[PDB]
């Protein structure tokens, strides 16, 4: 269930153009305005390769708690422009491939580590 959240905090299956306007509704759209959140992640795909990420298979072991993608993932990082953490936020996107990191717990994605994306 904290699985749950983070689904809905870093993933959308299949965005279009993933460019501000895309951040800006998603984010809204998400809950993750009140307040503005400084720097969000979301991850594209199918959930199957994301999950597997908890496996020696799409996952190696990384870091403390962490595990680390074999395979890279689409993405787009929303990042917060212009101080007030207060709507309306506005937001500036940047679409990028590579792998991810994220913390499994019962082998499931229950943390995105933002870290890589600053």
């Not at 299956?13 to 501000?20: F, M």
């Not at 993750?32 to 908890?54: E, M, Q, V």
């Not at 993932?73 to 792998?99: D, E, I």
């Amino acid at each position: 269930s904290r699985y749950t959240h983070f689904l809905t905090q870093h993933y959308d299956a299949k965005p279009q153009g993933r460019d501000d306007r895309y951040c800006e509704s998603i984010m809204r759209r998400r809950g993750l305005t009140s307040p503005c959140i400084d720097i969000n992640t979301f991850i594209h795909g199918n959930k199957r390769s994301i999950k597997a990420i908890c496996e020696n298979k799409n996952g190696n072991p990384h870091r403390e708690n962490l595990r680390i993608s074999k395979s890279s993932f689409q993405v787009t990082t929303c990042k917060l422009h212009g101080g007030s953490p207060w709507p309306p936020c506005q937001y500036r996107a940047t679409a990028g491939f590579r792998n991810v990191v994220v913390a499994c717990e019962n082998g499931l994605p229950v943390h995105l580590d933002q870290s890589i994306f600053r």
